[PDB]
Ligand binder design. Structure first.
Ligand SMILES: Nc1nc2c(ncn2[C@@H]2O[C@H](COP(=O)(O)OP(=O)(O)O)[C@@H](O)[C@H]2O)c(=O)[nH]1
Length: 176
């Protein structure tokens, strides 16, 4: 659509960014969508690690699950220095996991080396009946308690491509 126009604009952009959130929160699906189902994936530093380097065009994305490999957390956090932005993805329909996930976001932004980096929280799976909306996400994840930086929250759906356009707008506009 116009969505396809933003995808093209987005992959010419020279930026690093990070996509992190709990497992099964829609992370790879989201890349699928904005990459039109074609991209390169490479475990970092090598195979065996949770961390993945998505590349396509000029964009490189550092992608990991919070809780995939707890031992390597510090290594992952530190790898996310210098990024243009943080995309923190949550399943807005899985309300039982909201508290735990809200906590690792706050933990993540408590870290000095990641000071000042913009955060887009995405409340995915909006299509599922009863999934948390934008206002509620902000509420239940205490997003107003984060003010050391620029922080934005959108509700989206990868399976329906709802709000992916404004997401790409946000991202494209936040390259350094
Ligand atoms: N209903 C719905 N399911 C989704 C959406 N996005 C992803 N999923 C599903 O959520 C599950 C986890 O997806 P995945 O991208 O692999 O999660 P990841 O571990 O965060 O990368 C899969 O079954 C997806 O098909 C969405 O917007 N709506």
């Amino acid at each position: 659509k116009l969505l396809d126009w933003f995808k093209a604009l987005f992959w010419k952009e020279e930026m690093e960014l990070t996509l992190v959130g709990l497992q099964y929160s829609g992370k790879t699906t989201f890349v699928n969508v904005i990459a039109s189902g074609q991209f390169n994936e490479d475990m970092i530093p090598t195979v065996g690690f949770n961390m993945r380097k998505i590349t396509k065009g000029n964009v490189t994305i550092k992608l990991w699950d919070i809780g995939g490999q707890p031992r390597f957390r510090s290594m992952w956090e530190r790898y996310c220095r210098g990024v243009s932005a943080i995309v923190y993805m949550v399943d807005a329909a899985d309300q039982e996991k909201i508290e735990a996930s809200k906590n690792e976001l706050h933990n993540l932004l408590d870290k000095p080396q990641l000071q000042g980096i913009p955060v887009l929280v995405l409340g995915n799976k909006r299509d599922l009946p009863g999934a948390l909306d934008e206002k509620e996400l902000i509420e239940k994840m205490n997003l107003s308690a984060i003010q050391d930086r620029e922080i934005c929250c959108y509700s989206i759906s990868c399976k329906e491509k709802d709000n992916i356009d404004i997401t790409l707008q946000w991202l494209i506009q936040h390259s350094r």
